[PDB]
Design a protein around this nucleic acid. Structure first.
Lengths: 52, 52, 52, 90, 51, 1358
DNA sequence: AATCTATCACCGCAAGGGATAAATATCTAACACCGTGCGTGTTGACTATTTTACCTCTGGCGGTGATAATGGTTGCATGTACTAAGGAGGTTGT
DNA sequence: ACAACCTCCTTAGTACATGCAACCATTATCACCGCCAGAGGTAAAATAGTCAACACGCACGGTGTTAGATATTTATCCCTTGCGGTGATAGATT
């Protein structure tokens, strides 16, 4: 439902975005909202697992 | 700026330097799209202005 | 937030006695050739001579 | 008047000679405090300079009429001896 | 939508004919409240606010 | 009294010793255990002055204590550190040596003093060969070259009076023995009866150089110098650094390398070494000198370890980075700043918002400058505790500014005046810049975190002129025409449109009230349909009030606007829907009639009026603001089914693959345009259910439609993509694709529809991001040529002028008389009989209502004054421009037309080469330009008129500016419409109407070119090829003829006037009834004739057309390159000939490249010849025979020859129409008084074609303000002189040699310019604008025009 | 510019809340004493403050080596888009 | 006799505007080591001094007692609240 001239902006505004004091998730989404949390280790993940 | 930006930064694809050209000494060989981009290189995840 | 850059007076380029320019220099900012064309077009000679 | 100002151009018919007449009042206030004949209504010196042609009178162009004649009505008094001075050139 | 940042600023003491250069707080009658926040070595404390 | 201006020559090897003090002898700058900057080297204090302030080396003269001395102990001066800025050094060159800008400077300069191979003059300077120099016991003679291995015995009988020698020494020696008391006077007798051409194309460069040397004080020795002057250290600022490192940069190190090479060349001569080592070191020294001068240009560059070249001396001048552009014509500035723009809706129009700590920063000179002047701090030192604190005492000190102080504001890059304006502070929070909403339009403010800049004026004079000249309230209008651009802005005008729209049911289908508090009484709306008698008034030109009264059909919001409207104009103007389409014209009407203050208040108070109600409209974009036509289903049963058989017809053998591409893309266009019809019924009316008690089929309240009918931001090209079909796109090659988007943004886009339209979007956004340079660089070079037109004078005596017309392309009225004539002045006593037989004398200022009296008589031509019809020296005379368009008055004596006109073209070109191309993801057009329709009960009044009745069934208009007034039952006009010539009427005069009712029509692309009279068809003022060219089709056999006028013609008939005709049973005019004169119908080019001679037709029937895709203030469009040579003024580089002799044509005298045609007149006895290009296509071979210039080949007519073969007013009447009509197709109606500037400044030069006894030569093109020396003394003392004229030199040539030459040095190609400034030893007069920018003076416009008048009574005392 | 009747309400005038200041009682601080120890004084012997003298450091800088060594390096100015100028030379013309 | 003209020769003159962020490296190359300077070292005496001795003598600070202040407690007083009775407002008219 979007023209390329604003899809271009969407592909950059999400990148110009910055950490904030009370951050909150994309409620609408694609599924990448959990991949992009792990694709640089910004969330720690159980590389073996067990009991904390 | 935030995690999504560094995650895509690590997989940026320049068209420049010895093997391509610059922002200045270049036409559309470095800026436009060709159909084999399908499945491979998204035509909207670029900076804006003359950097397109 | 980072870019509140005004100036009364400050740094000067020894190479030309003109202001330096830059936030990283607390500089003075460029009244350009196009900005001169507006004062020329207005017939505003004292505001122009002020910059010069 | 501060609240819009181009009407001082249409008051005369031109726009930069306007600024020379304004400056002729302006310097005589900013470097001489010379007498006004209308108030300011907070149009501070930058625009008291324009007030002079919102009206059309109080630069020295009417001191050239007033104070320059206060001399010359002594020249009229004294004309009875200005003859002897003007005869006494010969 | 308050954001949080971490930024860096630095200084030097050059090789003089002896070797060191000075670092202290003496700037008398120039802005005294903008001095009240410093180490013996003329440096702010970790944990102090500054503006 | 003031120092006048500046003069030039070159640095004579002797005269340098009047400015300098010794050899800058060594490379170093320090000495181990002492800082003492090197005694005799690049920091030689004995040559350049003291080190720390006043400080000599070695002791005894330091601090402010000692000054005006020379220290004994090391021989060093005691002055000040900054004396290192101009106490120059020198270096004695151990060879005569070049200077790069006389050799690498194409055309170059050394050859123009020797007339000997420029290819190898450089080797003679590299000291590779010998030449003969002087004598009277000659045997060889001068300029004979040699090697060196012979000379000997003849010296015993001839060796008293002859000499010959090597290289640069021998060239510099030969340059002693010419005699200017005899050379220059004899170089001119060829001009009597005999002078040639290519030898003139070269040697006039020398003849001009030598005459310019004599008239300016130059000397040819200055080509081949023996001394390098040395850049003063403070311009390359030699100092140490705290990091134990030094300022050794570039403009120091280049001199180390030169000093070293020259100190070897010295030692090698001092020892008389092998001459090999001397020859190599000469070549290495010239290499290092010319690389120090202009590094890189000598086919090589000098570099350092981080690979880079070193900055040359010429990199302070030649290209972009030079002083002219980086430090003079623009520069870094104090009392200034920048920040992000923010909308400030409570700022009144004269105001701007500024954070308290930014006001503190910008006003420090008022604080650290008044505490010490009231006692409000104990000292400026202690005050640090109080000023940085923003303490109470700061704010009296700042109201004493703010309460009457004009801040300046800036939105670079300032391609147009309104990008800079003046205001008044308001204090605020934050870190932004707050910006009044009506000027946000005038700036083009783009709120994506882009910025604006701020400048404080501090002189009393700058503040006086800022309020008088730059203030927003005092510059409201478009300089190109005169609509407001300081204007009710982006969503403000949806509020005003909403207050002025009305509805069915409406919470008030008819209802009224006052009182905003009644929006809280239970039942009200701004769409509720008020009616009220309102007595209403209209100010006359004399100042009285034409009182009126009327019933109204209106709303609460239309009634509230009678609070805001300046009630000296009538309520009935508000009785409409005030979108961006309409609202500007209320303010425009106020400006035309009431006065400035009334028009400002009416613009300002509309702002808050918009903000009170724009929100309460509830207008949105959302999923059911996106309706779709159901009957799209039926349309898909047509278009996709038409394609389905057509793709079989290709395969079964009834189409090829190629026509099939068009024959399917056209069907995709027809599918989009079919759906686009159903779309508008559903979007605008489809409430169907079957009344009574149902079916409110009203005009819709869909927001996406309202976003276009308000003009807020919407268009038909947006609506197609949002309510029916996105349609078609371009590929990266620019042409259309067989792959449509049959869906719209509510139906969706699949991966492929996204991906394909993304290619067109990438191409368009990449052209958006690049093709601006092809307009901005041109705009920069344009101002250098354009500047000098300050309104200086009054009538200039030029009793001549251009025959301008409405824009009538033969078969449309694309611009009426009004818009083009807008406050220009007549040049003849114009009169046209027709309806009121009006006469408008010469020297009358044509404000709009002079045009109204002419348009009733359907006036289609008027001789007017022109910015080209202007004799005035540098400046211009008021009659040539008449009325300013931005301040709005009879144009102020001091207004700078030159820069205003350049800006009026450079901005809209650069603007729309972005604002159309960022859209390439979809394409469509739609139009309605073909009919006129009545809207209420009334009676018809034909006006401005002739009209006829037609045997083929029609009633038709036959006049060029025609109108159709609508009247009530009693005599009140209620509407009027312009109506084209050839428009078919559906009504008679005094007939009756009810509304919903078409009353006139014409072709979608044409007003059909139509007859008054019945007879045979004929042609007149026409010749085939030379005025018209052919087209043909089948069906019955068929014809058409394209008309040709000013881009297209041969020499033999250049200025013909093509005119269709109606005639008797054999011969001549069926004279026009009631105006009994020839029945002849004149046209421009670009129209197309569609009936021919010997055909026979009726009154009110047709002969010609146009393929006019209408453009407009919509659809949109964009482009530029075809404009270029209309301002660079050459010929096509391919002379694809159109022949100059009729019918008898052959080949017969072929030659060693180009063809040679051989030709003869049809009844003559006299053959001629033509040189057609080597290989070029011919559309003819043996039988295909025509008049003087039909399509034998296709070469378009050269723009410079439109001057040479039609004259200055004729060429102006087409350059000021073709470029103008590109901008008219963009909807940008620039008045002709702007493109006339660029034509005046190609006409800046004035040809001269023989010698004399004044300003007179041959082969010359003098600045016109000089050559008037002819009339200035011929008419007073008789003298002797020659033919003189005017030229069409392009911007790339006209700029290179202005008299304001201080400006021209900034043009670029700065070597070509500065070498001519050196050759002419040139001496300025300060008469443009840029010259006084460069010398930091009052610029010769407005408030500095008001100072240049004093200089004009020093230059004229007695 | 004076008159008032007839609004929406402040006055008409009862109640009651907090306040602060009185008196009491607690706190601390200012002092005066005492004791400690340091920087109160001259004298005297020490040893190394400075000077000059002498005997003998560090670093100023001038001077130039020989079994013989005898055709060198140097990499990328730039690929585009324009087009104005000079350069070439044979010749078909001026 | 020269003139420019046909052709592709090469040359080389330019390439719009405002602003912010960053940090300041690579070379090798015998400097030889011989001489001697004023010149480094230091012993013994000038320009003059240390600080330990035994005296000298004083200031300062902490322990003790006293002083009075202050913050508490108490209780008084006034200014304020909220409602009510009915006020001459607001402003239309004289």
């Amino acid at each position: 439902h979007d023209d390329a001239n604003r899809a271009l902006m969407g592909a950059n505004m999400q990148r110009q975005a910055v950490p904030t004091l009370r951050a909150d998730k994309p409620l609408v989404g694609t599924g990448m909202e959990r991949a992009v949390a792990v694709d640089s280790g910004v969330t720690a993940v159980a590389k073996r697992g067990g009991v904390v | 700026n935030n995690p999504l930006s560094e995650i895509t930064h690590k997989r940026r694809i320049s068209a420049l330097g010895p093997g391509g050209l610059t922002r200045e000494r270049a036409g559309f060989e470095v800026r436009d799209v060709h159909p084999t981009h399908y499945g491979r290189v998204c035509p909207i995840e670029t900076p804006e202005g003359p950097n397109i | 937030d980072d870019k509140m850059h005004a100036r009364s007076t400050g740094s000067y380029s020894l190479v030309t006695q003109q202001p330096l320019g830059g936030k990283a220099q607390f500089g003075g900012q460029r009244f350009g050739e196009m900005e001169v064309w507006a004062l020329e077009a207005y017939g505003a000679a004292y505001t122009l001579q002020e910059m010069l | 008047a501060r609240v819009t100002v181009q009407d001082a151009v249409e008051k005369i018919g031109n726009r930069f000679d306007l600024v020379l007449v304004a400056a002729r009042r302006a310097r005589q206030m900013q470097v001489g405090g010379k007498d006004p004949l209308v108030p300011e209504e907070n149009d501070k010196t930058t625009v008291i300079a324009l007030r002079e042609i919102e009206e059309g009178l109080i630069n020295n162009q009417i001191l050239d009429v007033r104070e320059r004649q206060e001399q010359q009505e002594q020249e009229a008094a004294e004309l009875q001896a200005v003859t002897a001075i003007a005869e006494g050139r010969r | 939508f308050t954001t949080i940042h971490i930024q860096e600023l630095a200084c030097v003491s050059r090789d003089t004919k002896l070797g060191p250069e000075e670092i202290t707080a003496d700037i008398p009658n120039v802005g005294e409240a903008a001095l009240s926040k410093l180490d013996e070595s003329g440096i702010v404390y970790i944990g102090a606010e500054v503006t | 009294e003031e120092f006048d201006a500046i003069k030039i020559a070159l640095a004579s090897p002797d005269m340098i010793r009047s400015w300098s003090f010794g050899e800058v002898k060594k490379p170093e700058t320090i000495n181990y255990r002492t800082f003492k900057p090197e005694r005799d080297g690049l920091f030689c204090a004995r040559i350049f002055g003291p080190v720390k302030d006043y400080e000599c080396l070695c002791g005894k003269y330091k601090r402010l204590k000692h000054r005006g001395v020379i220290c004994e102990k090391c021989g060093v001066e005691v002055t000040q550190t900054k004396v290192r800025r101009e106490r120059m050094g020198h270096i004695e060159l151990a060879s005569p040596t070049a200077h790069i800008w006389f050799l690498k400077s194409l055309p170059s300069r050394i050859g123009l003093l020797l007339d000997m191979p420029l290819r190898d003059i450089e080797r003679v300077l590299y000291f590779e060969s010998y030449v003969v120099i002087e004598g009277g016991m000659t045997n060889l003679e001068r300029q004979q070259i040699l090697t060196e291995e012979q000379y000997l015995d003849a010296l015993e009988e001839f060796g008293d009076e002859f000499d010959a020698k090597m290289g640069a020494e021998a060239i510099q020696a030969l340059l002693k023995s010419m005699d200017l008391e005899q050379e220059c006077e004899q170089l001119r007798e060829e001009l009597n009866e005999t002078n040639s051409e290519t030898k003139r194309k070269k040697l006039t460069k020398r003849i001009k150089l030598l005459e310019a040397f004599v008239q300016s004080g130059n000397k040819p020795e200055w080509m081949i110098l023996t001394v390098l002057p040395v850049l003063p250290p403070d311009l390359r600022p030699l100092v140490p650094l705290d990091g134990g490192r030094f300022a050794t940069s570039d403009l120091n190190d280049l001199y180390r390398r030169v000093i070293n090479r020259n100190n070897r060349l010295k030692r090698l001569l001092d020892l008389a070494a092998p001459d090999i080592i001397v020859r190599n070191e000469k070549r290495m020294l010239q290499e290092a000198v010319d690389a120090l001068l202009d590094n890189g240009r000598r086919g090589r560059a000098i570099t350092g370890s981080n690979k880079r070249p070193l900055k040359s001396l010429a990199d302070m001048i030649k290209g972009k980075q030079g002083r002219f552009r980086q430090n003079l014509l623009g520069k870094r500035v104090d009392y200034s700043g920048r920040s992000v723009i923010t909308v400030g809706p409570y700022l009144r129009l004269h105001q701007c918002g500024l954070p308290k700590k930014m006001a503190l920063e910008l006003f420090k000179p008022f604080i650290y400058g008044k505490l010490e002047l009231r006692g409000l701090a104990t000292t400026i030192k202690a005050a640090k505790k109080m000023v940085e604190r923003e303490e109470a005492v700061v704010w009296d000190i700042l109201d004493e500014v703010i309460r009457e102080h004009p801040v300046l504001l800036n939105r670079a890059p300032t391609l147009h005046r309104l990008g800079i304006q003046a205001f008044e502070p308001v204090l605020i929070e934050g870190k932004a810049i707050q910006l009044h909403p009506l000027v946000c339009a005038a700036y083009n403010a783009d709120f994506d975190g882009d910025q604006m800049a701020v400048h404080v004026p501090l002189t009393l004079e700058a503040q006086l002129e800022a309020r008088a000249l730059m203030m927003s309230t005092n510059n409201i209008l478009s300089p190109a025409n005169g609509e407001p651009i300081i204007v009710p802005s982006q969503d403000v005008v949806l509020g005003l449109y909403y207050m002025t729209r009305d509805c069915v049911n409406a919470k008030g289908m008819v209802l009224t009230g006052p009182a905003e508090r009644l929006y809280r009484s239970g039942l009200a709306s701004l769409h509720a349909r008020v009616k009220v008698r309102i007595t209403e008034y209209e100010k006359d030109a004399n100042g009285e009030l034409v009182a009126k009264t009327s019933l109204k059909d209106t709303t609460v919001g239309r009634a509230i606007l009678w609070m805001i409207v300046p009630k000296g104009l009538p309520y009935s103007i508000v009785n409409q829907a005030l979108g961006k389409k309409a609202i500007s014209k209320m303010l425009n009407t106020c400006y035309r009639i009431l006065g400035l203050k009334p028009t400002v208040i009416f613009a300002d108070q509309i702002m808050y009026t918009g903000f009170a109600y724009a929100a309460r409209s509830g207008a949105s974009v959302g999923i059911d603001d996106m309706v779709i036509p159901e009957k799209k289903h039926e349309i898909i049963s047509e278009a996709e089914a038409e394609v389905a058989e057509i793709q079989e017809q290709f395969q079964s053998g009834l189409v090829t693959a190629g026509e099939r591409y068009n024959k399917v893309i056209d069907i995709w266009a027809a599918a989009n345009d079919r759906v686009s019809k159903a779309m508008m019924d559903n979007l605008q009316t489809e409430t169907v259910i079957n009344r009574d008690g149902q079916e409110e089929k009203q005009v819709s309240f869909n927001s996406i439609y309202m976003m276009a009918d308000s003009g807020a931001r919407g268009s038909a090209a947006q609506i197609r993509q949002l309510a029916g079909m996105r349609g078609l796109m371009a590929k990266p090659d620019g042409s259309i694709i067989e792959t449509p988007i049959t869906a719209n943004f509510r139906e969706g886009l699949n991966v492929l529809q996204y991906f394909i339209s993304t290619h067109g979007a990438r191409k368009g956004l990449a052209d958006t991001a690049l093709k601006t340079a092809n307009s901005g660089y041109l705009t920069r070079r344009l101002v250098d040529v354009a500047q000098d037109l300050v309104v200086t004078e009054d009538d200039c005596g030029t009793h001549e002028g251009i025959m301008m017309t409405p824009v009538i392309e033969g078969g449309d009225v694309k611009e009426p008389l009004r818009d083009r004539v807008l406050g220009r002045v007549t040049a003849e006593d114009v009169l046209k009989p027709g309806t009121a037989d009006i006469l408008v004398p010469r020297n009358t200022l044509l404000h709009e209502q002079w045009c109204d009296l002419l348009e009733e008589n359907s006036v289609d031509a008027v001789k007017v004054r022109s910015v080209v019809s202007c004799d005035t020296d540098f400046g211009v005379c008021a009659h040539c421009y008449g009325r300013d368009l931005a301040r709005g008055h009879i144009i102020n004596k001091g207004e700078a037309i030159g820069v205003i006109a350049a800006q009026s073209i450079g901005e809209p070109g650069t603007q729309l080469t972005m604002r159309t191309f960022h859209i390439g993801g979809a394409a469509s057009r739609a139009a309605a330009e073909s009919s006129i329709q009545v809207k209420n009960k009334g009676s018809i009044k034909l006006s401005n008129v002739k009209s006829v009745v037609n045997s083929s069934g029609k009633l038709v208009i036959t006049s060029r500016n025609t109108e159709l007034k609508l009247i009530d039952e009693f005599g009140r006009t209620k509407e009027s419409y312009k109506v084209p010539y050839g428009a078919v009427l559906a009504k008679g005069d005094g007939e009756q109407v009810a509304g919903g009712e078409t009353v006139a029509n014409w072709d979608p692309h044409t007003m059909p070119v139509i007859t008054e009279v019945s007879g045979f068809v004929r042609f007149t003022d026409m010749i085939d090829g030379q005025t018209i060219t052919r087209q043909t089709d089948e069906l019955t056999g068929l014809s058409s003829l394209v008309v040709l006028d000013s881009a297209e013609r041969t020499a033999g008939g250049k200025d013909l006037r093509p005119a269709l005709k109606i005639v008797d049973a054999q011969g001549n005019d069926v004279l026009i009834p009631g105006t009994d004169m020839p029945a002849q119908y004149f046209l421009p080019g670009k129209a197309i004739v569609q009936l021919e001679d010997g055909v026979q037709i009726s009154s009110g029937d047709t002969l010609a057309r146009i393929p006019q895709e209408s453009g407009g203030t919509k659809d949109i469009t964009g482009g530029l390159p075809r404009v270029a040579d209309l301002f660079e003024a050459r010929r096509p580089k391919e002379p694809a000939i159109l022949a100059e002799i009729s019918g008898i044509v052959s080949f017969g005298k072929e030659t060693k490249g180009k063809r040679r045609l051989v030709i003869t007149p049809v009844d003559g006895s006299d053959p001629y010849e033509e040189m057609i290009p080597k290989w070029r296509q011919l559309n003819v071979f043996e039988g295909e025979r025509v008049e003087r210039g039909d399509v034998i080949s296709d070469g378009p007519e050269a723009p410079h020859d439109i001057l040479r073969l039609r004259g200055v007013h004729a060429v102006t009447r087409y350059i000021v129409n073709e470029v103008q009509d590109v901008y008219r197709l963009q909807g940008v109606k620039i008045n002709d008084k702007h493109i006339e500037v660029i034509v005046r400044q190609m006409l800046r030069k004035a040809t001269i074609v023989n010698a004399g006894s004044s300003d007179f030569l041959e082969g010359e093109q003098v600045e016109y303000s000089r050559v008037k020396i002819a009339n200035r003394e011929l008419e007073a003392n008789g003298k002797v002189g020659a033919t003189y004229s005017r030229d069409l030199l392009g911007i790339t040539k006209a700029s290179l040699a202005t008299e304001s030459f201080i400006s021209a040095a900034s043009f670029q190609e700065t070597t070509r310019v500065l070498t001519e400034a050196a050759v002419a030893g040139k001496r300025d007069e300060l008469r443009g604008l840029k010259e006084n920018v460069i010398v930091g003076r009052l610029i010769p416009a407005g408030t500095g025009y008001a100072y240049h008048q004093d200089r004009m009574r020093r230059r004229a005392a007695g």
